[PDB]
């Protein structure tokens, strides 16, 4: 799931560390 | 306080004292080649097989080197792995190590680190609390939720198991149960509980069932820092971005994009409509429980700033327009698509994830009554051929009560104040 006119999921990003 | 030395590793406090200060002095590399020289010398050694791991991380945070910090993240492992490892050390190593995965977004990795945590340390509330985290960063709501239940049933007044209960139910649109949850959770003021997420949802919650105090949490929300304004409740941000509701194609300085919209907006429509027709299938109904009741569905053409290539066999001309825009083509942080929406229908006053956006809204199916759009304070209607611009990240809202279908196209782009760096990296949403 992505967030794309709301902001459901528990995040919204996937990040990838620095 | 915590105990960290089994009894071997008392015998050898004083080299292991010797390499941690030359760690806690910012001699990272002496420090690393210390503890690798205990590890060595003193193989089952879990103190030292800890300080090489906090070397490492250290190492990583001064390289700012995600490949140094999976180092780490290894000797993390290596540290449970040793014999006669005492229960505080296995805790902070195992621990560290889950959060470092995280941070690194090996989310399933991190996710088994937990299952193992909640193991070995069954009386541990605070790493159920974790666990549960570990599931909702995979999207595994439903284990998510048994976890927070477990917590709830011998900790019931744990506040951060609590808003994580509350944010479960009112993500399964279990809304007026999710209330006291999420409500009752930040009032505790526990450790994780002041978090714009709740905040958020614990506002819209109220609102969706008529309840008038769901602005005073959105107030306090804005008082605690977690949103840039009572109306605007984004949580994905750059600070400083002009916010404004409703933006004029000037003052986005996308008028060359603007304008083609406008001029070729019958080709736009055409090709939207042909696949109402002939592959409906492409659409595909809204899935973010935004509706309060109606039919709402979207053909998304970019997603993430990725271009949809099967979804472009179906509006070929119009992707051939987008691509020279690259301000709507590479906006990882929205997408284009058309929106379909039928009589009937509500949508629920909400707001998108991040500031970094606008959309422009095309009319290209209009009826001449029962169509408009709330955003924040001001409520406009679309036009056939004209373009419409909002910021998202303002609470808006929808009805459709026409006598047939409504069609618009919807095209996001980059927030004009960010910086082409910033436009590269922005992580997508
Ligand atoms: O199709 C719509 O009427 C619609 C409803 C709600 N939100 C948005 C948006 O663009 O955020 C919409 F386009
Ligand atoms: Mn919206």
Same mark, same amino acid.
């Not at chain 2, 941070?103 to 605070?126: A, E, I, K, W, Y």
């Not at chain 2, 159920?128 to 049933?153: F, H, P, W």
């Given at each position: 799931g992505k967030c794309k006119d709301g902001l459901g999921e528990y995040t919204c990003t996937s990040l990838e560390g620095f | 306080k915590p105990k960290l030395l089994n009894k071997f590793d008392k015998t050898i406090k004083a080299e292991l004292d010797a390499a941690e200060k030359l760690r806690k002095r910012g001699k990272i590399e002496e420090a690393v080649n210390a503890f690798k020289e205990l590890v060595r010398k003193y193989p089952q050694s879990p103190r030292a097989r800890y300080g090489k791991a906090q070397c490492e991380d250290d190492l990583a945070?001064?390289? &700012?080197?995600?490949?140094?910090?999976?180092?780490?993240?290894?000797? #993390?492992?290596? /540290?449970?792995?040793?014999?006669?490892?005492?229960?505080?050390?296995?805790?902070?190593?195992? !621990? &560290?190590?889950?959060?470092?995965?995280?941070? +690194? =977004?090996?989310?399933?990795?991190?996710?088994?680190?937990?299952? &193992?945590?909640?193991?070995?340390?069954?009386?541990?509330?605070?790493?159920?609390?974790?666990?549960?985290?570990? #599931?909702?960063?995979?999207?595994?709501?439903?284990?998510?939720?048994?976890? #927070?239940?477990? /917590?709830?049933?011998?900790?019931?007044?744990?506040?951060?198991? !609590?808003?994580?209960?509350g944010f479960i139910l009112k993500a399964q649109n279990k809304i007026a149960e999710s209330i006291p949850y999420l409500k009752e959770g930040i009032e505790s003021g526990d450790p994780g509980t002041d978090d714009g997420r709740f905040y958020f949802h614990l506002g819209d919650a109220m609102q969706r069932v008529g309840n008038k105090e769901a602005y005073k949490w959105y107030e306090l929300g804005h008082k605690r820092g977690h949103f840039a304004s009572v109306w605007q409740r984004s949580l994905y941000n750059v600070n400083g971005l002009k916010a404004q509701p409703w933006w004029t194609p000037k003052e986005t300085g996308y008028t060359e994009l603007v304008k083609s919209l406008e001029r070729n907006w019958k080709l736009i429509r055409d090709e939207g409509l042909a696949v109402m027709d002939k592959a409906k299938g492409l659409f595909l109904p809204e899935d973010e429980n935004l509706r309060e009741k109606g039919d709402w569905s979207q053909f998304t053409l970019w997603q993430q700033g990725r271009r949809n290539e099967n979804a472009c066999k179906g509006a070929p001309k119009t992707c051939t327009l987008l691509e020279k825009f690259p301000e709507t083509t590479g906006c990882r942080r929205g997408q284009?698509? #058309?929106?379909?929406?039928?009589?009937?229908?509500?949508?629920?006053?909400?707001?998108?994830?991040?500031?970094? &956006?606008?959309?422009?809204? +095309?009319?290209?199916?209009?009826?001449?009554? =029962?169509?408009?759009?709330?955003?924040?304070?001001?409520?406009?209607?679309?036009?056939?051929? !004209? /373009? +419409?611009? *909002?910021?998202?990240? *303002?609470?808006?809202?929808?009805?459709?009560?026409?006598?047939?279908f409504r069609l618009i196209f919807i095209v996001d782009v980059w927030h004009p104040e960010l910086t082409p760096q910033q436009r590269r990296s922005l992580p997508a949403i």
């Open positions: - | 945070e001064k390289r &700012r080197s995600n490949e140094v910090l999976r180092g780490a993240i290894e000797t #993390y492992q290596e /540290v449970a792995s040793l014999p006669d490892v005492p229960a505080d050390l296995l805790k902070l190593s195992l !621990k &560290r190590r889950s959060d470092r995965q995280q941070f +690194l =977004g090996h989310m399933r990795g991190s996710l088994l680190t937990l299952q &193992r945590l909640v193991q070995l340390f069954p009386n541990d509330t605070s790493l159920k609390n974790d666990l549960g985290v570990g #599931y909702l960063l995979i999207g595994d709501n439903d284990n998510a939720k048994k976890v #927070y239940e477990e /917590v709830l049933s011998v900790t019931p007044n744990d506040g951060f198991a !609590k808003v994580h209960y284009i698509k #058309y929106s379909i929406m039928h009589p009937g229908t509500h949508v629920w006053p909400h707001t998108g994830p991040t500031n970094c &956006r606008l959309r422009m809204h +095309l009319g290209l199916v209009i009826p001449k009554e =029962g169509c408009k759009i709330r955003c924040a304070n001001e409520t406009k209607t679309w036009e056939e051929g !004209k /373009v +419409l611009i *909002f910021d998202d990240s *303002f609470e808006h809202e929808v009805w459709q009560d026409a006598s047939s």
